[PDB]
């Protein structure tokens, strides 16, 4: 019983992949809204330990210059899609002088989301958010271990994602601003957290048109966290 | 040594001399008019004849006998199976009497009211509602059914998250009854011997027939009966005949009457077709989890019994337990209560509130399984 | 010795306990009464002085009673006094004290109160205001009108001390105790189980206020027999019959539920969750300091020079309890009289130290990944 | 020699032996399934073989069984268990029923719910003769149904009976009836005056209370 | 529906084939290597000695797998020799690899990662054989190892067998000797152990075998001893018995 | 010696226990093979210690002699109390699940002792750890298997009540013996008199016991798995 | 008829004496004269090899 | 759902054979070790001789590089292919690029291949948890754990083996910023936890340290035994 990778449900599909989405919900979340202005997005760390140093910690990396990134659950293999996906697009510069759109990233990575094969390994567990600016403007993505992909107006997950996207369904119109997107984004962060909310917790990860490079806060992050 | 020894000598010694130093008419005469009184064996009736009594009768395990009646009977009702008074030498008829019930299933009617109300189970106002149509609207007043020409249904299957008010509900009808209440377990039918449980469900409805317009309540459904499950084993066989004779016996070839039996369960998909079928139970009154300001009703419950401090909110908390059952939310309340109590204060706080939500939902909901290992953050 | 008076105490408290008309009345109730006064068995009671009664094969009658007894002491499912004559009910008869309640019922505060303990005291407290407080002085609820909690759970290593707290607080008690192990409950019949879980805890229900504790809970859950007719869903039917029970309806009761397991995780969470158990508590092995207190109690009443620091038996053994340090003591007074002496000397120590911890303390078969 | 009735368990077989027995004015008899097998051991045998004398002696006898597969086991050997006077009671049933000494005078009918626990001997060629499956309500008799319900409540007259059953598809005339009745309730939520077609409407949709909004992954 | 463990741990945490493969290692012979420094022994027990068979072998549990090293054995014989053909192939490629003979230590946990691989991946049934490590070189001399199925193994002066030998090794410790490069000492010492331990009457020599590995100048041979001096070794040690006698 | 010292001073001298105040053994287990004299040991301690020995196995008949089989078996508490000298042996999870239960009540949860079970067999590890905990169970006692002079003494004694030829030896047979039970040798010794019986003689010469050890000898066969 | 059972249900004990009055008395030491016994069954498989 | 193959997951998303990997690894031996400012410092605890046999060949501690310096958790073999798998990898580094082999690269090397190697098909996973200390980048001092999982984590002090969390919560309770840069006071840290080991029995205790410049130099149980001398000799002072 307990039928894995090569079996259905009598409704519906794998037990398996279901068991994945369901291993999304145990880690910990992170809120991207894009902004015309510019995508930014934040993370909870989760730091248990005083000897657990804070930036050892990622979350957040970059893609490319102006692409970040989030994850949701499974570590090392979410940062084997990033390097994996970083040669896809150095593969994209490589032969069209030029930087693969965000979304046909996500397709990239998107087609082995499900071409796991224990025959002819297994299937990952972790939900991704891409943030990047292409010749679009501001690029904010969601995709899942599933492979079902959709571009995302302002995405939580992991842990209190349903609060989290209610109420950011209540803060969000399409005319946010930046700096209104990020602390009202800490503010739900904040909310949904049981920690003291302080600069060990969370980062910042704010990518614009002109600031396509740093997609980042370093110590004003601190400043925007006494602005609250 | 020489002060137990020596006191236990002078207790001894103490005993010693003292056990040397040892050494109505409330009714009597009526009951001495008792003694012409008479020893009144009942016994059980075959049959009857034809024009005259010339009646039939085991006593239980003796013998089988044509006997007649005393000519103080009613001569009409000393009908078949019917439990009524012998003379020991005569062997006369004097009353008929109710007959054998149960040995101890005379002992689940409730005989009492328990003071659930219906304000505590708040928060699933639309099953109060419905479940105030079912059994409450007919049972009290037939105002609109009988006036339209309609029916009020029969039965109602009940389930949820466990610490939802099953209980609360089944209870709660129970303060408010205007009926004859009586409890069910599903491990009730669990017997040792063949066809015991189907007997059982005889003289369950037998006491449901007797009485009109009363309760019935079913807990646990689980034990009675999943399916139909067919092996070269012969497993659940019992539990199975007991289950379709509790379909039998609960309705089809002359229904219930006035009756109401209400269901619960936590695992409403494990269930036959017969029994989710309608005209058995009609409306599936579901239960939820407590996903709003219901949350804030249920501490208000949970909180006008007790003293506190005025200056507390309760959206906070309630916020703070999106997946709370109100048996979690009650240990929080009285946990902050009993932190209170830790307190030599007389009215709690709400960062005691904070204590008990910090205490059970970290120290009893996250320690229960121990984490020992970060790999996921 | 002293022998004198303990043997003399003791005969003169069996004599004292072996030192066990004008009423005219009384004797015509007497005389009411017959000689032969046979027993009866109720089926039910009607109002009218005279109930339906039930003899030994089955003869049942409609009979009154001897009207200066109560009918009150009258339930269906009593034993009675019955006359040869009329029948008629002669008294109420003292119930049939079964073997449930002189085995189970035990009468004996057994064992050491409080100061049998090591690495105590915040299990103390609890146990004591979520038992003791709401038993002895349940006036703190007056104060606020505020619900106890009901049920408690000992967990952790074997020998902890389980049955030393188990035997503290039926030391300190003044409900009646039940004491039931779990392995009990599975036997070579159907539907078994959960009828001794209803008589049980009917039982734990009539007399008083209780304290019903059970232990090896979780012996029901991990075990399998041939010795057992059906299986898990017979099991199941029984830890079904135990959850109405423990979280049954109408007024539960003063019965003060408490349990103890050695692990916890096989066990159903539907019994974790509060409302039936308020009070999980855990048990660890406390401390390396506490140790010298359970050497102070298990050597307190033992002749025994100094010969010794406890700081060798602290810096020789990571897992500490009253099995462990109790062990060395009786091992090492087996040392002590092997070698035909008292005050016990530090090498019965040693080999009593490396006999308890080689006694279990090892592995598996050596080498494994050391 | 016996009819038998098998299928759904909503399409209605009290329904003949309650039409049936109400039409016809023989000696009815009824009979369920776990009443046979008693307590002690050999007790089904005194109480099938007395029925047996009973109806054999009320000639015009038609006997109806209720839940017959209670009793009617595809049995098996095996070692270390088995519920035998299942097996008892039921081939003092068949026996009794037929074989040795044929009566002429028993007219059987029987109810199941499902088929094939039982044995191939229970039925075999006219131990029940007739093989009556039970069909489903296609469309017309849903709406038939819901008409013969719909008789007794007072309608405001504005409904198609034929939308409701070319919407609602497979259901019994238990659940046309519950359409019919939660459908009065309904009209009583209002309470104020006769059946609308919205009565009728929302009646089904509780009916339809299939609500697995499951739709993941099918986007 | 037909797997094995073969790969996986036992429930709680611990392991299945390793402690059956040990089960079946404590029922065997028994062999020991001493501490010598002027070379080393080995003492072995026979197996199966029933009289109609040939003996012609010269080395049963002993092999001498290259030049200056040997090694005793238990568990499954042929898989035994699969190992041994195996280890003078691994070692042969070194001295084809170098010209120069093998350090022992990287033949031993070489062969102990061949066995570990078996412990790992491709559930099979892995070898239940423990064996010993007689040799010498230029860094550390004489030296003796115990082959483990855990691919673990051991740098030893007094080894260990299974369930005949744990006396034996109780016997190593409450007699171990200390400083003495004595060989004819080791050889009572050893008749001493096989003479307790050894349930035979009298240590007959038939169900024994001892064979040593000295240093000869540059060549360092090994004695594959017959079986008078194991005769003179037992009337010798039955007078050391004899000696233990005198306090009666 | 060993269960003199372990069970004969618990019934000679509690004085010497309580005299420096320790807590006296209650369970010895006792392991080994089969016909080692396993109840034979125990029935010559508590007939010479004078303790009522009770043999308690499996059967209805015993449940219905201890009480009338209704619940359990501590009404054997009640027959050991009021025969509290009481010697207790049980045979080899159902007999050590009732010896479970029973240890758990008798260690410490009862009155005066002098009440101690008693259980031999082989397979020490297929019964319970925590069973084995050292406040649980004490004295884990071997049994040897008989050798070559404990099958000559174990031979005179089942020899010795016996006719015997004028002119006889019991070495020979003692070594002719690769190990035997306790009871074994009683077979050798009375079918050996079957075959002085056959032969119509009452004395029972060497050549009976070589067709007796010959007719035991049954026992152990089959060469040619060498194997091990 | 039946075959064996492990000690299950405790009327099948009466069913199993009551079978082997049959197994003894069908033969016995007095054998039977002229007494043809004539059998039916449905399933004979499920019948005790003693029969 | 079940606590066999490595491949599927829990109903709740879990791989209960990852977690009994984690499980050898907690029932290992103890070993602690910090980073000094320049002298980086470790060791092993629970040496634990047995009379007969050489401790050459049980060496828990050995080096990839010279910059570097290994230490594990579990049991031994599979940290043994580990570390050869590692020389040749820090060797093939070395091969390829003519740096010093930094302990980031080397354990996303070991992280990875324990990652992978968890991920294929009938391969038990490596029940082992690495302790790496490399002080490279113009000698920063840096020392990485591993997991069963496979992730390489940075700290700054570290115990495993059993009661890692409790003298773990010691150095919680001896984290001092004056230990380092007084790497005298970081020889009293580490005799501090030797000194805080479960048995603390001074001579099962085996330390090796490194001054980011230097080899691995392994102590002696004589300047050990005065390292216990001083330790009770302070404790003395706190007295
Ligand atoms: N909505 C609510 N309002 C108030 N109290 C609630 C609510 N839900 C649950 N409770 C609390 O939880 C209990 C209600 O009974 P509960 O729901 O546990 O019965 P149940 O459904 O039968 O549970 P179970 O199937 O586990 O026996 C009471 O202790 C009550 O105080
Ligand atoms: N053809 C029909 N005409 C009218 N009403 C029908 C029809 N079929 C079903 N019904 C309705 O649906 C119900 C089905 O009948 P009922 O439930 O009494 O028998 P049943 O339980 O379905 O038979 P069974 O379950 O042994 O197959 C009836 O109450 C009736 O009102």
């Not at chain 3, 707290?165 to 009990?184: W, Y």
């Not at chain 5, 000695?49 to 200056?68: A, G």
């Not at chain 5, 491709?122 to 550390?140: A, C, N, Q, T």
Request: proline content about 4%; glycine content about 6%.
């Amino acid at each position: 019983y307990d039928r894995g990778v090569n079996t259905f449900s009598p409704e519906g599909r794998l037990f398996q992949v279901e068991y994945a989405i369901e291993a999304i919900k145990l880690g910990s979340t992170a809120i991207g809204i894009q902004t015309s202005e510019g995508v930014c997005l934040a993370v909870e760390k989760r730091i248990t330990s005083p000897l657990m140093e804070p930036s050892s910690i990622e979350k957040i990396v970059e893609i490319d210059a102006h692409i970040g990134c989030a994850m949701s659950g499974l570590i090392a293999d979410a940062k084997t899609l990033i390097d994996k996906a970083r040669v896809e697009t150095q593969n994209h510069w490589f032969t069209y002088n030029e930087t693969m759109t965000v979304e046909s990233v996500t397709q990239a990575v998107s087609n082995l989301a499900l071409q796991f094969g224990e025959e002819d390994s297994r299937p990952f567990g972790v939900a991704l958010l891409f943030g990047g600016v292409d010749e679009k403007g501001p690029q904010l993505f969601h995709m899942d271990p599933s492979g079902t992909f959709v571009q995302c107006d302002a995405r939580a997950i992991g842990s209190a994602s349903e609060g989290a996207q209610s109420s950011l369904q209540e803060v969000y119109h399409k005319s946010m601003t930046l700096k209104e997107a990020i602390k009202s984004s800490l503010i739900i962060l904040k909310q949904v957290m049981e920690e003291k909310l302080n600069a060990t917790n969370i980062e910042l990860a704010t990518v614009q048109p002109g600031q396509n490079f740093h997609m980042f806060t370093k110590e004003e992050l601190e400043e925007v966290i006494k602005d609250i | 040594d020489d002060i137990q020894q020596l006191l236990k000598k002078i207790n001894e010694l103490t005993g010693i001399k003292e056990s040397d130093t040892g050494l109505l008419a409330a009714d009597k005469q009526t009951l001495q008019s008792e003694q012409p009184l008479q020893v009144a064996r009942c016994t059980k009736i075959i049959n009857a004849d034809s024009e005259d009594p010339k009646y039939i009768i085991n006593v239980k395990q003796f013998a089988k006998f044509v006997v007649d009646l005393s000519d103080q009977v009613a001569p009409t009702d000393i009908e078949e199976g019917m439990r009524v008074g012998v003379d020991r030498n005569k062997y006369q008829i004097h009353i008929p009497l109710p007959p054998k019930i149960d040995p101890t299933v005379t002992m689940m009617q409730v005989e009492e009211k328990p003071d659930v109300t219906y304000s505590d189970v708040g928060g699933c106002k639309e099953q109060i509602e419905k479940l105030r149509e079912v059994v409450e609207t007919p049972l009290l007043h037939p105002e609109r059914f009988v006036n339209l020409g309609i029916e009020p249904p029969k039965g109602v299957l009940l389930f949820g998250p466990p610490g939802t008010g099953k209980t609360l509900c089944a209870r709660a009808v129970a303060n408010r009854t205007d009926a004859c209440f009586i409890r069910v377990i599903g491990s009730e039918l669990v017997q040792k011997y063949v066809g015991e449980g189907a007997r059982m469900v005889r003289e369950l409805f037998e006491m449901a027939r007797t009485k009109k317009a009363c309760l019935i309540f079913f807990d646990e459904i689980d034990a009675i009966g999943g399916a139909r499950f067919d092996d070269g084993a012969g497993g659940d066989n019992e539990v199975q005949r007991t289950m379709l004779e509790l379909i039998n016996q609960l309705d089809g070839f002359d229904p219930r009457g006035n009756i109401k039996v209400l269901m619960a369960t936590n695992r409403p998909d494990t269930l036959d077709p017969a029994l989710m079928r309608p005209g058995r139970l009609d409306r599936k009154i579901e239960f939820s989890l407590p996903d709003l300001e219901g949350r804030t009703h249920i501490f208000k419950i949970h909180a006008r019994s007790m003293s506190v401090e005025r200056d507390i909110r309760f959206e906070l908390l309630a916020r703070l337990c999106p997946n709370s059952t109100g048996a979690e939310i009650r240990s929080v309340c009285t946990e902050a209560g009993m932190f209170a109590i830790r307190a030599r204060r007389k009215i709690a706080t709400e960062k005691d509130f904070l204590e008990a939500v910090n205490k059970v939902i970290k120290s009893y909901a996250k320690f229960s399984a121990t984490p020992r290992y970060m790999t996921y953050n | 010795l002293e022998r004198i008076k303990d043997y003399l105490l003791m005969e003169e408290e069996f004599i004292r306990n072996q030192e066990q008309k004008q009423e005219e009345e009384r004797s015509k109730v007497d005389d009411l009464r017959g000689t032969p006064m046979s027993v009866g068995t109720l089926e039910e009671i009607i109002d009218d002085n005279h109930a339906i009664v039930s003899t030994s094969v089955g003869s049942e009658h409609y009979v009154s009673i001897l009207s200066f007894v109560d009918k009150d002491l009258l339930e269906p499912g009593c034993s009675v006094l019955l006359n040869h004559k009329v029948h008629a009910v002669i008294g109420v008869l003292m119930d049939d004290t079964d073997p449930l309640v002189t085995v189970m019922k035990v009468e004996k505060a057994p064992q050491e109160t409080y100061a049998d303990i090591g690495g105590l005291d915040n299990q103390i407290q609890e146990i004591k205001e979520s038992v003791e407080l709401p038993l002895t002085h349940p006036e703190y609820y007056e104060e606020m009108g505020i619900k106890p909690p009901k049920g408690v759970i000992l967990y952790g290593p074997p020998g902890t001390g389980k049955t030393l707290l188990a035997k503290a607080v039926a030391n300190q008690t003044s409900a009646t105790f039940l004491r039931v192990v779990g392995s009990e409950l599975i036997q070579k019949y159907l539907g078994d189980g959960p009828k001794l879980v209803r008589e049980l805890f009917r039982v734990a229900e009539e007399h008083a206020p209780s304290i019903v504790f059970i232990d090896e809970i979780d012996a029901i859950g991990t075990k399998r027999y041939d010795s057992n007719s059906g299986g898990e869903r017979e099991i199941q039917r029984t830890m079904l019959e135990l959850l109405n029970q423990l979280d049954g309806f109408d007024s539960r009761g003063d019965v003060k539920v408490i349990m103890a397991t050695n692990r916890i995780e096989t066990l159903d969470p539907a019994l974790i969750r509060p409302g039936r158990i308020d009070r999980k508590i855990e048990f660890p092995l406390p401390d390396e300091k506490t140790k010298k207190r359970i050497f102070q109690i298990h050597t307190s009443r033992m002749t025994l020079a100094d010969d010794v620091t406890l700081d060798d038996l602290i810096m020789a053994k990571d897992d500490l309890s009253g099995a462990d340090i109790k062990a060395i003591c009786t091992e090492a007074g087996l040392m002590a009289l092997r070698e035909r002496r008292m005050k016990v000397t530090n090498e019965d120590f040693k080999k009593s130290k490396e006999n308890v911890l080689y006694k279990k303390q090892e592995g598996t078969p050596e080498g494994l990944y050391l | 020699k016996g009819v038998l009735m098998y299928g759904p368990p909503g399409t209605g077989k009290t329904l003949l032996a309650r039409a049936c027995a109400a039409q016809t004015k023989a000696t009815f008899l009824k009979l369920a399934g776990p009443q046979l097998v008693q307590m002690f051991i050999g007790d089904g045998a005194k109480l099938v073989r007395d029925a047996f004398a009973l109806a054999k002696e009320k000639a015009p006898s038609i006997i109806f069984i209720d839940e017959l597969d209670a009793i009617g086991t595809k049995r098996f050997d095996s070692e270390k268990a088995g519920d035998r006077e299942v097996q008892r009671t039921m081939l003092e049933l068949l026996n009794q029923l037929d074989g040795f000494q044929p009566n002429t005078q028993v007219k059987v009918i029987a109810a199941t719910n499902r088929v094939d626990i039982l044995d191939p001997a229970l039925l075999r060629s006219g131990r029940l003769d007739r093989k009556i499956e039970f069909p489903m309500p296609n469309e017309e008799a849903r709406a038939r149904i819901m008409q013969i319900h719909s008789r007794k409540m007072n309608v405001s007259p504005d409904v198609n009976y034929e939308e409701l059953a070319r919407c609602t598809d497979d259901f019994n005339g238990a659940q046309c009836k519950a359409v019919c009745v939660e459908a009065g309730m309904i009209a009583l939520r209002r309470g104020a005056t006769e059946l609308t077609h919205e009565d009728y409407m929302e009646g089904i949709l509780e009916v339809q209370a299939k609500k697995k909004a499951n739709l993941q992954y099918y986007a | 529906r037909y797997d094995s463990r073969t790969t996986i741990f036992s429930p709680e945490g611990r392991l299945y084939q390793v402690e059956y493969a040990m089960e079946a290692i404590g029922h065997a012979g028994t062999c020991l290597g001493i501490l010598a420094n002027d070379g080393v022994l080995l003492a072995a027990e026979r197996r199966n000695i029933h009289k109609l068979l040939d003996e012609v072998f010269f080395s049963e549990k002993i092999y001498k797998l290259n030049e200056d090293m040997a090694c005793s054995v238990a568990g499954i014989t042929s898989d035994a020799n699969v190992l041994t053909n195996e280890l003078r192939l691994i070692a042969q490629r070194y001295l084809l690899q170098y010209q120069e003979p093998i350090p022992c230590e990287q033949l031993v946990t070489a062969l102990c990662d061949i066995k570990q691989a078996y412990t790992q991946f491709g559930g099979k049934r892995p070898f239940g054989v423990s064996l010993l490590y007689i040799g010498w070189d230029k860094h550390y001399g004489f030296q003796l190892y115990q082959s483990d199925p855990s691919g673990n193994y051991g740098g030893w002066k007094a080894t260990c067998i299974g369930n005949n030998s744990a006396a034996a090794v109780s016997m190593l410790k409450q007699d171990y000797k200390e400083g003495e490069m004595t060989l004819k000492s080791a050889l009572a010492l050893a008749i001493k152990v096989l003479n307790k331990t050894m349930d035979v009457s009298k240590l007959s020599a038939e169900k024994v075998e001892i064979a040593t590995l000295t240093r000869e100048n540059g060549k360092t041979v090994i004695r594959v001893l017959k079986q008078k001096e194991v005769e003179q070794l037992i009337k010798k040690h039955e007078e050391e018995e004899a000696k233990a006698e005198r306090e009666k | 010696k060993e269960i003199k010292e372990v069970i004969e001073l618990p019934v000679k001298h509690p004085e010497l226990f309580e005299a420096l105040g320790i807590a006296q053994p209650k369970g010895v287990l006792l392991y080994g093979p089969p016909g080692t004299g396993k109840t034979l040991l125990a029935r010559a301690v508590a007939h010479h210690t004078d303790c009522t020995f009770i043999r308690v196995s499996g059967s209805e008949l015993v449940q219905k002699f201890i009480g009338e089989g209704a619940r359990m078996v501590r009404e054997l508490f009640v027959m050991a109390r009021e025969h509290a000298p009481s010697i207790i042996f049980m045979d080899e999870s159902e007999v050590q699940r009732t010896m479970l239960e029973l240890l758990n009540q008798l260690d410490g949860f009862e009155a005066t002792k002098n009440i101690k079970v008693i259980m031999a067999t082989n397979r020490i590890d297929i019964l319970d750890s925590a069973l084995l905990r050292p406040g649980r169970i004490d004295r884990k006692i071997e049994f040897p298997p008989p050798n070559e002079e404990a099958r000559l003494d174990i031979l005179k004694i089942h020899s010795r009540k016996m006719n015997l030829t004028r002119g006889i030896n019991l070495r020979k047979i003692a070594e002719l013996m690769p190990g035997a039970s306790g009871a074994e040798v009683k077979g050798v010794c009375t079918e050996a008199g079957m075959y002085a019986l056959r032969e119509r003689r009452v004395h029972v010469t060497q050549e009976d016991f070589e067709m007796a050890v010959a007719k035991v000898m049954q026992k152990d066969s089959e060469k040619n798995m060498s194997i091990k | 008829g039946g075959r064996r059972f492990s000690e299950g249900t405790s009327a099948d004990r009466e069913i199993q004496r009551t079978l082997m009055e049959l197994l003894n008395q069908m033969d016995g030491f007095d054998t039977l004269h002229r007494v043809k016994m004539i059998m039916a069954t449905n399933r004979p498989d499920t019948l005790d090899p003693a029969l | 759902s079940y606590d066999r193959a490595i491949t599927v997951f829990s109903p709740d998303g879990h791989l209960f054979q990852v977690e009994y990997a984690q499980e050898a690894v907690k029932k290992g031996s103890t070993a602690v070790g910090v980073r000094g400012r320049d002298i980086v410092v470790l060791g092993v605890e629970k040496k634990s001789v047995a009379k007969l046999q050489d401790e050459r060949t049980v060496r828990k501690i050995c080096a990839l590089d010279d910059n570097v310096c290994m230490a594990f958790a579990g049991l031994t073999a599979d940290a043994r292919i580990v570390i050869n798998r590692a020389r040749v990898e820090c060797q093939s580094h070395r091969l390829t690029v003519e740096d010093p082999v930094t302990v980031e690269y080397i354990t996303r090397y070991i992280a990875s291949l324990k990652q992978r190697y968890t991920q294929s098909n009938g391969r038990r996973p490596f029940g082992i948890s690495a302790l790496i200390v490399g002080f490279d980048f113009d000698g920063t001092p840096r020392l990485y754990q591993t997991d069963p999982s496979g992730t390489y984590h940075a700290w700054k002090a570290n115990a495993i083996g059993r009661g890692a969390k409790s003298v773990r919560e010691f150095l919680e309770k001896n984290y001092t910023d004056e230990a380092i840069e007084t790497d005298d006071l970081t020889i009293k840290l580490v005799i501090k936890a030797l000194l805080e080991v479960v048995q603390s029995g001074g001579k099962n205790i085996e330390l090796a340290v490194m001054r980011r410049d230097q080899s691995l130099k392994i102590l002696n149980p004589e300047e050990i035994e005065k390292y216990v001398a001083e330790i009770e000799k302070e404790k003395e002072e706190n007295e």
